[PDB]
Amino acid sequence: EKSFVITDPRLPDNPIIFASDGFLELTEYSREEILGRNGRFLQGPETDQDIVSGATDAIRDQREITVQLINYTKSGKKFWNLLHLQPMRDQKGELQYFIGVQLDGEFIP
Amino acid sequence: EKSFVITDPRLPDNPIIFASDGFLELTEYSREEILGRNGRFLQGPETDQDIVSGATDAIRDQREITVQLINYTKSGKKFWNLLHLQPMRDQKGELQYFIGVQLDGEFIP
């Protein structure tokens, strides 16, 4: 299944309001464990903070970006998360949601 | 002039959407330079990260806080910023804006 989430940047700290079954499977968290949280909950000691701070600034500026960073499953297993973030805008062009796709790393070294 | 800003936590990363003339004067930045930025842009090498972390936790949790931390004017001059951050709620009690007041540090030693 594709792993993706939908966040609402019109709510405080841009929480996840929808998580695909692929995301549950990739992360090992349940839907109850995920919803209402900011995506950074997957991050941990080895995550690159310069990439994180860079993504924060890009997201504030409503840019579409791709980043690759270390995340952790619920049980503490590290994985490379190739994460594509895209604003979704309403009919008038105003930001409504962000879509985050956790892309497969199979052909990514 | 009193120095303050209004941020919008219903836009990603709580950007500054209004800056008082006193804030322009305190920081040396222009209105154009400031709007759309997160307040953290004033921070720099000597800012205390434990205080930053503390503020960030309170803000994400929609709480009122007062902090004191080192900031930098546009030209690189350090000043102590005694910063009071307050949620502003709508008629129903839902978070609408944050007000951040940069209080005068004259009688704060």
Author numbering:
A (entry chain A), B (entry chain B): 2 to 110
The authors write:
By using a flavin transferase and carving a flavinylation motif in target proteins, we demonstrate that “dissociable” flavoproteins can be turned into covalent flavoproteins. Specifically, four different flavin mononucleotide-containing proteins were engineered to undergo covalent flavinylation: a light-oxygen-voltage domain protein, a mini singlet oxygen generator, a nitroreductase, and an old yellow enzyme-type ene reductase. The crystal structures of the designed covalent flavoproteins confirmed the designed threonyl-phosphate linkage. The elucidated crystal structures confirm that the covalent attachment does not significantly perturb the binding and microenvironment of the redox active part of the flavin cofactor.
